[PDB]
Enzyme design. Structure first.
Site, PDB file in Angstrom:
ATOM      1  N   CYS A   1       0.934   0.187  -9.725  1.00  0.00           N
ATOM      2  CA  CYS A   1      -0.107   1.045  -9.156  1.00  0.00           C
ATOM      3  C   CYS A   1      -0.989   1.653 -10.235  1.00  0.00           C
ATOM      4  O   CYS A   1      -2.222   1.724 -10.075  1.00  0.00           O
ATOM      5  CB  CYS A   1       0.520   2.158  -8.301  1.00  0.00           C
ATOM      6  SG  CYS A   1       1.536   1.546  -7.008  1.00  0.00           S
TER       7      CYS A   1
ATOM      8  N   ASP B   1      -3.307  -0.346  -2.327  1.00  0.00           N
ATOM      9  CA  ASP B   1      -2.703   0.390  -1.212  1.00  0.00           C
ATOM     10  C   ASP B   1      -3.747   0.761  -0.167  1.00  0.00           C
ATOM     11  O   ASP B   1      -3.512   0.627   1.039  1.00  0.00           O
ATOM     12  CB  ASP B   1      -2.012   1.645  -1.729  1.00  0.00           C
ATOM     13  CG  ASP B   1      -0.861   1.311  -2.623  1.00  0.00           C
ATOM     14  OD1 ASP B   1      -0.276   0.251  -2.382  1.00  0.00           O
ATOM     15  OD2 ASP B   1      -0.590   1.998  -3.609  1.00  0.00           O
TER      16      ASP B   1
ATOM     17  N   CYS C   1      -2.579   3.502  -5.390  1.00  0.00           N
ATOM     18  CA  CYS C   1      -3.451   2.580  -6.123  1.00  0.00           C
ATOM     19  C   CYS C   1      -4.543   2.047  -5.206  1.00  0.00           C
ATOM     20  O   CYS C   1      -4.481   2.176  -3.977  1.00  0.00           O
ATOM     21  CB  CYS C   1      -2.640   1.400  -6.730  1.00  0.00           C
ATOM     22  SG  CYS C   1      -2.196   0.088  -5.640  1.00  0.00           S
TER      23      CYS C   1
END
Ligand SMILES: [Br-]
Length: 208
Positions: free
Chosen positions: A159, A99, A96
């Site tokens: 995500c 991240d 995602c």
């Protein structure tokens, strides 16, 4: 805005299974080499019995494996996604948008990040270092956040709803159509990077 709810639920999801926070950083550093990571390699880096590495990964239901059962994806992944995470010319991927903002500090590397606006398909890119973001294109780039849910598959719950957008107004237009998403919020990419810094600070605290 006020991002404490997101920091709180992200930390709780990592600290919910004992061991996860302590396995995450060593695993991310290994995956960042761009090669699959065996459970045996990980146990050796952690100085853990193999059964303990296994029990932690068992609770991480989104973990990606290859044909040999090596780990190839846990937030950072060797398998292609919408979020390109390039370090030292190795093209890796992320689950995602958030991240890509968090990992550089955890692995101590600078990444060239690129994706597409989830509202318009416009290209987006930026350079993420442990301390700062640079070369933000477009400058007004935005990120969607949702509240992670208890004991839900973290990638389908969080995500898959956490995207880059070309601009905050573009993202708010998109967001108006997706109000069923729990705690959906639009922030600038700078706000999202700050959320990542707070997550990482608390994460490193809670490590052994
Ligand atoms: Br708040």
């Amino acid at each position: 805005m006020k991002l404490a709810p997101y920091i709180l639920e992200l930390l709780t999801s990592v600290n919910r299974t004992n061991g996860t926070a302590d396995l995450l950083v060593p695993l991310l550093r290994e995956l960042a080499k761009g090669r699959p990571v065996s459970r045996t390699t990980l146990a050796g880096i952690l100085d853990w019995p193999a059964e303990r590495v296994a029990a932690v990964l068992e609770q991480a239901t989104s973990t990606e494996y290859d044909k040999d059962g090596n780990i190839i994806g846990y937030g950072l992944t060797l398998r292609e996604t919408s979020y390109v995470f390039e370090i030292d010319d190795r093209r890796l991927y992320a689950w995602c948008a958030l991240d890509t903002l968090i990992f550089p500090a955890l692995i101590g590397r600078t990444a060239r990040v690129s994706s597409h606006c989830a509202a318009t398909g416009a290209p987006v890119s930026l350079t993420v270092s442990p301390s700062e973001i640079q070369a933000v294109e477009p400058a007004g780039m935005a990120v969607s956040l949702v509240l992670p849910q208890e004991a839900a598959d973290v990638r389908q719950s969080f995500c898959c709803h956490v995207h880059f957008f070309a601009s905050v107004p573009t993202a708010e237009d998109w967001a108006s159509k997706h109000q069923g998403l729990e705690g959906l919020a639009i922030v600038s990419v700078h706000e999202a990077f700050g959320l990542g810094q707070e997550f990482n600070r608390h994460l490193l605290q809670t490590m052994s």
